[PDB]
């Protein structure tokens, strides 16, 4: 779903990575997702690892796809090589559609995989706490709205 992708984007924003990440388009060349995977496990997804991900991409969608396949393979490899408890990867994102068409539905599937890494890695209690703090944060917005109406 495209709506799931929008929601998972707000989760991506909790990482505060360097590259901009406000829209679906900001995620299509793979740089943001690579930087998030580095936050999740910087020992595995390290600076050397990130080197394979081209930054100067522009509108070269073939290059975007290339980047995205490296990230997807990276996620699968992390799951196989490092993680004891495997993630839910029965259905994989079609990253060709992300790169060529900025397909939000496919991008959402990829973000789900990355969230799967976050909540199954060694630091999972940190990431689960950060997700529940998204709930606390929204209630502050709602309480502000209520107070501006009273």
How was it solved? Answer: X-ray
- Chain-centroid distance, C-alpha 110: 7
> What CA–CA distance (Å, rounded) separates 71 from 63?
13
> What CA–CA distance (Å, rounded) separates 97 from 103?
5
The CATH number assigned to the domain holding 10 equals 1.10.418.10
The distance in angstroms from the start CA to the end CA of the chain is: 37
Domain boundaries, position 72: 1-150
Q: Are 109 and 92 in contact (CB under 8 A)?
A: yes
Supply the DSSP string of the chain, one letter for each residue: -HHHHHHHHHHHGGG--SS--SSGGGGTTSHHHHHHHHHH-TTTS-HHHHTTS-S--TT-HHHHHHHHHHHHHHHHHHHHHT-SS----SS---HHHHHHH--HHHHHHHHHHHHHHHHHSTTHHHHHHHHHHHHHHHHHHHHHHHHHH-
Q: How many domains does the chain have?
A: 1
Question: At what resolution in Å was this solved?
Answer: 1.7
């Amino acid at each position: 779903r495209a709506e799931l992708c929008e929601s998972l984007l707000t989760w991506i924003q909790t990482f505060n990575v360097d590259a901009p990440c406000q829209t679906v388009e900001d995620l299509t060349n793979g740089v943001v997702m690579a930087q998030v995977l580095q936050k999740i496990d910087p020992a595995y997804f390290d600076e050397n690892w990130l080197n394979r991900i081209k930054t100067e991409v522009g509108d070269n969608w073939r290059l975007k796809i290339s980047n995205l396949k490296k990230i997807l393979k990276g996620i699968l490899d992390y799951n196989h090589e490092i993680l004891g408890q495997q993630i839910n990867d029965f259905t994989l994102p079609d990253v060709n559609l992300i790169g060529e068409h900025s397909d939000a539905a496919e991008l959402g599937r990829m973000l789900q995989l990355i969230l799967g890494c976050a909540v199954n890695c060694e630091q999972k209690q940190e990431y689960i706490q950060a997700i529940m703090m998204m709930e606390e944060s929204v209630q502050h917005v709602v309480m502000t709205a209520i107070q501006e109406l009273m």
